């Protein structure tokens, strides 16, 4: 009975403690926004191409 | 933006239909609130892990919870048979391991129930997350998404890091140029290149901007060399134990390490009796 | 002892294949020891997947991810790895923004590479957290302590 003086729990338990949750990349914030605020520069800045200040305010000719 | 052509006429003179609310700000206040309360929770369980000094593994580490002192129950009284050894030695490991298991989570519990005591008496300043600015008839200029960008990025420079020096294309033309002007042509290369890593060896830690002093770290290469050191003298201990038995009876060798707990009972006249005969009869030599 | 005359890393198989052999032997199918070292071998092949992945960026396809599991890479090392891919990233970034829709876009890819580009915004773990990376060594360490106080009662 030398195998119940080890420690019971496991190296694999141990590690599925200690690392429970995949950890957040700093990158990850960064492309999830600026992939986001691109939609943003594309909809309301005056030099996109596809502006959309033509469709919510018709210009008057 | 293509929609259908109705083309029906309407015949009633109603008021028109408002709808209602159609709640969205409250649902969206709720989870900003829900999520500043979480980050004051986190706070929280960082300002009581640190105000009791505790180390960070520990307490996720469930061997910290095992009892290792607690009474371990002896197979030779549980009465069991030949092929029920191993089941009950698996019976004992899991009940201690939940155990071990149990207690963490009894621990997380209580640290949770302090955590929000003190999460709730706490009034949060935290920085917000940078959006580019739009006004509500207004655009968005490009410099300010270019500033947003800035900030994002500026997150991606980690709070204390190692001062690696890159050797500027100056300085080592310079240092190469003098290799040259020595005369020694073909190894400029190595001693522009033993400048770099000479520099790299020492490289140094930075607080912020600013350097911290007396900052001695532990490299993920040397903790595996230590590591690997005490892996093999741990490894060259077993192989000494075994070797000391398989010199005085290599019959131990005809018995496979993992059927041998299946041979065990708990009185010695129940132990199968599959290896004992071949055993004692490899254990008079070759003749 | 058949694949326990070798140490756990110290072998030419990864660690990963390496514990599936080592488990194999040591334990039958039914025993708890088996199942809960072939789940560690599980997670094992998954750091190995994650460093081989992380050294396909520098060391090509072909890889040899047991020499770096074995001996992970000095700050220098990867100081140097960082310099031999830098001007292929410089270059990659300036025609990445080049192709880029947006302008924006363009000023958010050369502002992610310039942040990339320096070694020093690297972000080591022990440096970042000392005391976390001592507690994960310590851990590797007490399994090993374990088993040697193993071998001492015996």
Same mark, same amino acid.
């Given at each position: 009975?030398?195998?119940?003086?080890? !420690?019971?729990?496991?190296?694999?338990?141990?590690?599925?403690?200690?690392?429970?949750?995949? !950890?957040?990349? !700093?990158?990850?914030?960064?492309?999830?926004?600026?992939?986001?605020?691109?939609?943003?520069?594309?909809?309301?800045?005056?030099?996109?191409?596809?502006?959309?200040?033509?469709?919510?305010?018709?210009?008057?000719? | 933006?293509?929609?259908?052509?109705?083309?029906?006429?309407?015949?009633?003179?109603?008021?028109?239909?408002?709808?209602?609310?159609?709640?969205? +700000?409250?649902?969206?206040?709720?989870?900003?609130?829900?999520?500043?309360?979480?980050?004051?929770?986190?706070?929280?369980?960082? =300002?009581?892990?640190?105000?009791?000094?505790?180390?960070?593994?520990?307490?996720?580490?469930?061997?910290?919870?095992? =009892?290792?002192?607690?009474?371990?129950? =002896?197979?030779?009284?549980?009465?069991?048979?030949?092929?029920?050894?191993?089941?009950?030695?698996?019976? +004992?490991?899991?009940?201690?391991?939940?155990?071990?298991?149990?207690?963490?989570?009894?621990?997380?519990?209580?640290?949770?129930?302090?955590?929000?005591?003190?999460?709730?008496?706490?009034?949060?300043?935290?920085?917000?997350?940078?959006?580019?600015?739009?006004?509500?008839?207004?655009?968005?200029?490009?410099?300010?998404?270019?500033?947003?960008? =800035?900030?994002?990025?500026?997150?991606?420079?980690?709070?204390?890091?190692?001062?690696?020096?890159?050797?500027?294309?100056?300085?080592?033309?310079?240092?190469?140029?003098?290799?040259?002007? +020595?005369?020694?042509?073909?190894?400029?290369?190595?001693?522009?290149?033993?400048?770099?890593?000479?520099?790299?060896?020492?490289? +140094?830690?930075?607080?912020?901007?600013?350097?911290?002093?007396?900052?001695?770290?532990?490299?993920?290469?040397?903790?595996?060399?230590?590591?690997?050191?005490?892996?093999?003298?741990?490894?060259?201990?077993?192989?000494?134990?075994?070797?000391?038995?398989?010199?005085?009876?290599?019959?131990?060798?005809?018995?496979?390490?993992?059927?041998?707990?299946?041979?065990?009972?708990?009185?010695?006249?129940?132990?199968?009796?599959?290896?004992?005969?071949?055993?004692?009869?490899?254990?008079?030599?070759?003749? | 002892?058949?694949?326990?005359? %070798?140490?756990?890393?110290?072998?030419?198989?990864?660690?990963?294949?390496?514990?599936?052999? &080592?488990?194999?032997?040591?334990?039958?199918?039914?025993?708890?020891?088996?199942?809960?070292?072939?789940?560690?071998?599980?997670?094992?092949?998954?750091?190995?997947?994650?460093?081989? %992945?992380?050294?396909? /960026? &520098?060391?090509?396809?072909? /890889?040899?991810?047991?020499?770096?599991?074995?001996?992970?890479?000095?700050? /220098?090392?990867?100081?140097?790895?960082?310099?031999?891919?830098?001007?292929?990233?410089?270059?990659?970034?300036?025609?990445?923004?080049?192709?880029?829709?947006?302008?924006?876009?363009?000023?958010?890819?050369?502002?992610?590479? %310039?942040?990339?580009?320096?070694?020093?915004?690297?972000?080591?773990?022990?440096?970042?957290?000392?005391?976390?990376?001592? %507690?994960?060594?310590?851990?590797?360490?007490?399994? &090993?302590?374990?088993?040697? &106080?193993?071998?001492?009662?015996?």
């Amino acid at each position: 009975d030398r195998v119940l003086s080890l !420690p019971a729990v496991s190296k694999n338990q141990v590690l599925e403690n200690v690392f429970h949750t995949a !950890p957040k990349a !700093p990158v990850e914030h960064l492309e999830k926004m600026v992939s986001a605020n691109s939609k943003v520069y594309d909809a309301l800045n005056l030099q996109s191409k596809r502006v959309l200040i033509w469709q919510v305010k018709p210009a008057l000719f | 933006y293509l929609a259908p052509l109705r083309s029906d006429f309407t015949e009633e003179i109603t008021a028109p239909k408002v709808a209602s609310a159609s709640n969205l +700000v409250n649902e969206w206040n709720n989870k900003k609130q829900a999520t500043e309360n979480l980050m004051k929770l986190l706070q929280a369980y960082k =300002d009581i892990g640190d105000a009791k000094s505790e180390p960070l593994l520990k307490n996720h580490n469930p061997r910290t919870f095992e =009892d290792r002192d607690y009474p371990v129950p =002896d197979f030779r009284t549980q009465n069991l048979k030949a092929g029920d050894v191993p089941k009950f030695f698996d019976t +004992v490991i899991s009940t201690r391991a939940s155990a071990a298991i149990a207690s963490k989570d009894k621990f997380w519990a209580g640290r949770k129930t302090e955590a929000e005591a003190a999460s709730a008496k706490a009034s949060a300043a935290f920085p917000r997350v940078a959006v580019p600015e739009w006004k509500k008839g207004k655009t968005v200029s490009i410099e300010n998404l270019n500033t947003v960008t =800035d900030k994002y990025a500026a997150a991606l420079v980690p709070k204390r890091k190692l001062a690696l020096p890159v050797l500027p294309e100056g300085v080592k033309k310079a240092v190469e140029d003098f290799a040259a002007s +020595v005369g020694q042509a073909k190894n400029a290369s190595e001693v522009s290149e033993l400048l770099a890593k000479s520099l790299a060896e020492k490289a +140094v830690v930075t607080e912020g901007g600013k350097v911290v002093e007396g900052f001695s770290y532990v490299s993920k290469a040397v903790a595996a060399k230590v590591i690997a050191t005490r892996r093999a003298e741990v490894h060259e201990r077993l192989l000494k134990l075994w070797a000391k038995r398989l010199l005085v009876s290599p019959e131990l060798a005809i018995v496979p390490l993992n059927e041998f707990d299946a041979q065990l009972a708990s009185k010695f006249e129940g132990i199968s009796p599959k290896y004992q005969e071949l055993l004692s009869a490899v254990a008079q030599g070759n003749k | 002892l058949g694949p326990q005359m %070798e140490a756990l890393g110290a072998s030419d198989l990864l660690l990963s294949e390496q514990i599936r052999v &080592i488990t194999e032997h040591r334990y039958t199918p039914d025993r708890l020891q088996y199942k809960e070292g072939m789940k560690l071998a599980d997670k094992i092949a998954a750091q190995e997947a994650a460093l081989k %992945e992380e050294l396909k /960026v &520098i060391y090509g396809d072909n /890889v040899d991810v047991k020499h770096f599991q074995a001996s992970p890479r000095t700050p /220098v090392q990867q100081l140097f790895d960082s310099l031999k891919n830098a001007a292929a990233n410089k270059e990659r970034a300036a025609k990445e923004a080049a192709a880029a829709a947006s302008p924006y876009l363009a000023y958010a890819v050369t502002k992610k590479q %310039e942040v990339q580009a320096d070694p020093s915004n690297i972000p080591f773990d022990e440096v970042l957290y000392p005391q976390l990376s001592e %507690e994960l060594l310590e851990l590797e360490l007490s399994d &090993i302590r374990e088993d040697e &106080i193993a071998l001492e009662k015996a």
